[PDB]
Amino acid sequence: MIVPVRCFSCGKVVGDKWESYLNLLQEDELDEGTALSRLGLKRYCCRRMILTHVDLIEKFLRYNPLEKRD
Template identity: 40%
Template structure:
């Protein structure tokens, strides 16, 4: 369960989570996916990169 907003700056990040996971699973580099999604702040980027799925 990913937080709806970035904990540091408050930007909504949950809307990008599914697309990020799908594209990374398809073999794209995380950096390229995050750049395409428009996530430029390192605080928002870490929300997606460091997320660990705890629910199935």
């Protein structure tokens, strides 16, 4: 499920930063805290938004709405 566009608490916008955040994690091999602070996420609620996100859109995408089995 694609990243929330806005922060549920302070109204800020975090939706656009997900793509750039993923870059710092393996291209620059940085840790999670410094990467989170590199993008201006300073309140811990924005860090909560980005840090604990389960990206489920890459699993539905390998799939079709037609013929799942059980």
